[PDB]
Ligand binder design. Sequence first.
Ligand code: 0GW
Length: 269
Amino acid sequence: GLGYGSWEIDPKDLTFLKELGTGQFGVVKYGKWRGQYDVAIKMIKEGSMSEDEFIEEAKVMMNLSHEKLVQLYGVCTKQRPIFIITEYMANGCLLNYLREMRHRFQTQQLLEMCKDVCEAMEYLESKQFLHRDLAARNCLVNDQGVVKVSDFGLSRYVLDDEYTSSGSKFPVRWSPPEVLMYSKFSSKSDIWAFGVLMWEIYSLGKMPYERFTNSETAEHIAQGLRLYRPHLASEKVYTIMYSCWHEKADERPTFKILLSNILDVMDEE
Ligand SMILES: CCOc1nc(-c2n[nH]c(=O)[nH]2)cc2ccccc12
């Protein structure tokens, strides 16, 4: 309506129903839009985000639509704090889901989770859109057990310097050598991170390099050493995740190639 662009949601259309948790930018809630449609509502803490830049980018993110990407519905802009409105994912973050041992996952389920993420990432790659912080903590799970990739590109708008530089909150354990050494981000740094995410999935949510500090991790990978095979990963699955960790970025696969490799293993195993 009148005072709203296509990227803007009227906060008066929201019904708040349950507090879901707290994240980077503060509280997240479950609610309904216009009485009917399930949404997640992120309340963005004052001073946490480069808001004008985020809002311009939200225009681009709205047009990223793939069934394995958590959809951005819009932003509530006229106000303090602003809200980000997204697709509700009832089973929450992938990391916590993996860590719940009651699920008793079969390896075919774990490979399906990898395939879900890979499809999302192949779509982002086709749009020349980098995630920049791919990890299990940034994937969500819906009520049907489908994994989707969330918060794609959002790290570009975080004002907390501890998060933004290789900083005490930087994702060292998901980063390739060229990122840690010289801040060279590319499609191939997303590929690296995807390999670590596969490792997280097959490790049922263990922390990568769990016995090392971030400084030790950086030293280990710069010296050419790697994560090794999770017990639940077959030789073929391990080969796929390991392929993401070539020292030379141009020898790493694309997401299209990874997807093909994952589908081959699904057929074989
Ligand atoms: C602090 C974030 O926590 C959570 N976020 C979402 C969520 N859905 N969509 C989205 O963008 N976030 C869904 C959840 C479901 C159960 C428990 C926690 C959840």
